[PDB]
């Protein structure tokens, strides 16, 4: 009564967006090491039971389309949905190879009123990206 | 009815306004930790339990090293935003 029902044919779909190279116009550098993250994540979520697919160096439009389409698929037999974002970013936004896009617009596609097949099902987003330029010097 | 914003969970590598560190040869801190915890407990712990251990692993096992003193000995703490209405287990 206090747990999400996991009795479905599939655990769910998992989208991994691996952004390593960016258009010089964005002024962002190469994110070396992001491939290790992607592969590590792939095996992990795969072990959980997710049907994961990795998309490399996506444009803002590509990311939006990816998430939109996924939200338009039929999740009737899935227990949940997962999406992992690896890239450059700032407060409220994440980088595509060609610029920034609102994280909010990527996730809004999954609202209860825009994706009936995920209603009452957990929608998970993991984000590895900067959210500002503040430094945490730590203590003691 | 159900709130259209219900049942969403965001697991950020860092808190609002801060940097998020990445190791070129080992990968980012948040992902290294996340994967090691899931590899060992993804099947027996609740989502919040897993992510909390990730917060601890990131906050303790890591500390930056850079030539630029402004990036030297830096720390990090992830940020979990939950609108989940139930407990989450990846099993049974």
């Amino acid at each position: 009564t206090y747990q999400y029902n996991m009795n479905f044919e599939k655990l769910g779909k998992c989208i991994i967006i691996n952004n390593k190279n960016f258009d010089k116009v964005t002024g962002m550098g190469v994110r070396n090491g992001t491939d290790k993250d992607a592969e590590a994540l792939f095996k992990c979520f795969r072990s959980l039971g997710f049907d994961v697919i990795v998309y490399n160096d996506c444009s803002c439009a590509k990311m939006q389309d990816l998430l939109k389409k996924a939200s338009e698929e039929d999740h009737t037999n899935a227990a949940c949905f997962a999406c992992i974002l690896l890239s450059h970013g700032e407060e409220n936004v994440i980088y595509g190879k060609d610029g920034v896009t609102p994280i909010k617009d990527l996730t809004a596609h999954f609202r209860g009123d825009r994706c009936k097949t995920l209603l009452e099902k957990p929608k998970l987003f993991f984000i590895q990206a900067c959210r500002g330029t503040e430094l945490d010097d730590g203590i003691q | 009815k159900i709130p259209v914003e219900a049942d969403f969970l965001f697991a950020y590598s860092t808190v609002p306004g801060y940097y998020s560190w990445r190791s070129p040869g080992r990968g980012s801190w948040f992902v290294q930790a996340l994967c090691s915890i899931l590899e060992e407990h993804g099947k027996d712990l609740e989502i919040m339990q897993i992510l909390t251990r990730v917060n601890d692993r990131v906050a303790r096992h890591f500390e930056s090293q850079s030539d630029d003193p402004h990036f030297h000995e830096k720390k990090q703490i992830p940020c979990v935003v939950s609108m989940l209405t139930k407990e989450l287990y990846f099993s049974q």
């Binding site: 550098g29 994110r31 070396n32 090491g33 890239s87 450059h88 970013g89 590895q128 990206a129 900067c130 | 590598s13 940097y19 998020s20 560190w21 990445r22 190791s23 070129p24 980012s28 930056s64 090293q65 850079s66 990036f71 830096k74």
Partner: peptide, 4 residues
Amino acid sequence: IEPX
């Protein structure tokens, strides 16, 4: 170490 590099930032993101």
